[PDB]
Symmetry: C3
Subunit: 323 residues, 3 copies
């Protein structure tokens, strides 16, 4: 069973999982989502206590862990940012061992991947990465569940998508790893200086060879987006990035009437954010990486994607800790 192989695993990065393991998590996320909506959800974390360590705040990721935990019968302790990071006055080795004695599972959101890998080695319970500098694996699981729901029977391995703008960061990295694992066709469309780290690219190309996937890095929007089922962006220099804004024209360049728009959030798409009025003045634009028109269109699936953060985090905890 992929189920037996996932028990007691940490969830630190998608590089640590096989194609089939990732597909299992996504399929479990879909089952849990269906069960919650039907009122038939079976609690598999009943009596479990979970610690949520946020060295950097993220309300979106925190809420997704909390609600998943509550729904599954667990209780949570939220430990927010504090000015004294782990490793300042107490080693991560020591912190991990103490937390592991008290809690049944631990989430960690913070800085370097090295820190969460250390937590994962010493806690003695499942550790789950809610974001590090290098990777954002729970986001990409949500993104993949969302693509499946909006791609009308197409499997991941059949899907083409482009990520626009600054790809040299956790969400870029993870999207590229995920695409390679699952056999997808991913284009990273942005200035060459902001493509992902070349060593990660090479590792992903090798994975993609095994899966039938494709990774294209390009400065050319028209060629990057052509034929895409999804277009994805994130916040991101302005003069440099402006050509990569997702507007209706980019949508039209895909040549695909069913193209959908994704964004991990939060997004600068208008004047209503405080930055929005500033920059609509400061560079004469209404919205940055995406326009209000695209964000609020029927092409936009950003809020289904946000909701799926909870279902996919729930699957991670249920697969690894669930009883």
């Amino acid at each position: 069973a992929m189920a037996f192989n996932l028990r007691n695993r940490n969830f630190l990065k998608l590089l640590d999982f096989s194609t089939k393991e990732i597909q299992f998590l996504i399929d479990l996320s879909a089952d849990l989502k269906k069960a919650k909506y039907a009122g038939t959800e079976q609690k598999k974390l009943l009596g479990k206590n979970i610690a949520l360590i946020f060295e950097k705040a993220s309300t979106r990721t925190r809420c997704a862990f909390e609600v998943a935990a509550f729904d599954q019968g667990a209780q949570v302790t939220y430990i927010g940012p504090s000015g004294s990071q782990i490793g300042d006055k107490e080693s991560m080795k020591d912190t991990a061992r103490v937390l592991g004695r008290m809690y049944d599972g631990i989430q960690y959101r913070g800085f370097g991947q090295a820190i969460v890998e250390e937590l994962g080695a010493f806690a003695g319970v499942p550790v789950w990465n809610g974001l590090t500098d290098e990777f954002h694996p729970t986001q990409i699981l949500a993104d993949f569940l969302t693509m499946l729901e909006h791609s009308q029977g197409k499997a991941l391995a059949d899907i083409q998508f482009a990520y626009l703008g600054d790809a040299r960061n956790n969400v870029g990295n993870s999207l590229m790893v995920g695409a390679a694992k699952m056999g997808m066709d991913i284009r990273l469309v942005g200035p060459q200086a902001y493509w992902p780290d070349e060593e990660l690219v090479a590792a992903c190309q090798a994975i993609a060879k095994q899966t039938g996937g494709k990774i294209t890095l390009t400065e050319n929007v028209a060629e990057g987006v052509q034929g895409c089922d999804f277009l994805y962006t994130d916040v991101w220099r302005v003069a440099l990035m402006k050509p990569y804004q997702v507007n209706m024209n980019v949508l039209k360049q895909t040549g695909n009437p069913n193209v959908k728009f994704m964004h991990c959030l939060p997004a600068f798409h208008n004047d209503e954010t405080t930055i929005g009025k500033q920059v609509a003045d400061k560079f004469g634009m209404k919205g940055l990486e995406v326009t209000e028109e695209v964000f609020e269109s029927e092409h936009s699936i950003v809020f289904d994607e946000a909701e799926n953060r909870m279902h996919t985090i729930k699957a991670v905890m249920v697969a690894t800790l669930g009883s």
Copy 2:
């Protein structure tokens, strides 16, 4: 009535009919009794609630948490963050995301327009734990408290005075509530600190229909004469002018005597500056030779004071809001 309230927001008392408000108060009394008898039935089992506090209030937060726990719900407390909603992300976007994950949302914060936006976009019940303009949960607690302490009198038969600075959420809400419930309210304070003139006019129109009365006066003796309840709240180097302006409106034993009512009771939303057991309270009182500000220790700790029953009733009335709107 119960069916009318299902899935509604609780944003301000202006959004509710007389009978709905009476229903929420009666429910609060039932839930209080059930809790004390150990017969409380959980109606929020399995529900998840988000508590957004853009400005911290431990009192309101604890009332919401305890009410939720007692009813079988779970809570996520999201406290002040240095970035107010609308900085990195619009309230429209924040609402739509929270609304996908939670079953109910409390908001405590700044302008009424913000909570109204949250209430428009969330798609689940949104409850106002305080905004600049209104504090509706406090006033439900207050009205329950009055009914418990008025010996069979109905709200429509009650007379009360609010002393001091009325130009704020609690004053606004007390005036709306009184009008909706047909009560006789006196706002007693400097004219500059009466409630907004447009709201007053709106409340006069409501009061005309309900049999209520709204009197605004600078005259303490005339304002408090015949009252069943006297209500105040805090007024405040920067505060000297406000203390001198408000000092005539201090609730002391003499004001109680001016009611002519042996049974008069004293209410305060808290926290209160009634002695020198706070840093700010002692400082400012000392600066004027006072002991206690808006109310005296003698009144606050007397048998006439019901402030702690009133504070407790915060929880029972928040519980009723959540049960009526989200309960099943």
Copy 3:
């Protein structure tokens, strides 16, 4: 199997309890630990709501309270450090009376013992001290359970232990009070300026005289540790303090000076035992040392019981809550 109970009592400091009452909290902690591990735990705080007030942050104490409560069926509101300290905008008497109307029990961690005593006088519900300037009673219950688990049939009154370094603080104070109450032999081993408050020492000597306990204060390590079942230390911090405290480092040589093959090492945590912390490494490096109050070799040895001791924070807080609020 007791004649008394602690129902509706506060837990403010060990001085407030008799020898038998302390023993009962320790025995209950053990039973609760056993039940959790066996999956037979019965929830005695079902339906109870607890407020956790931290004026000063302690993730370790907070997590212990939260897990204990969850395991027992209770729910919790964590009120962290916030810029409004109690007594700023509102008196403690007023805060206490409001919290006591809403919650079934209240933990307080903060500043002076006087504050928590006032809370405990006015709340009308049980109040538990998670740490004040003067006392750390929950830590010492965990320490005593840990000692009993690792001492091979010996009762507290038969145990001898030494606390090394800076004893003039809550943990030193509580260890001394507890040792006195339970009839133990405690040695406080450190520079004389950092022995516990002289009035408390006198009070503890009077208690010890009634229980068969012994309290020894000494600057001499070899004499202080000789025969000890346990060696305990805590962080002592900085140049003047380090030179002063350095002779009291727990290293393998101090373990050897006990003459006891079964000696165990305890530390309330966190500990500066190596260079895997920013603060620990900077300070140790400027002074040429790998670890401060204890060495890596001791801390990671089979003599070290610090992670059992950390786990036992939870079991013992659970006992305090069950005993005083449990239904």
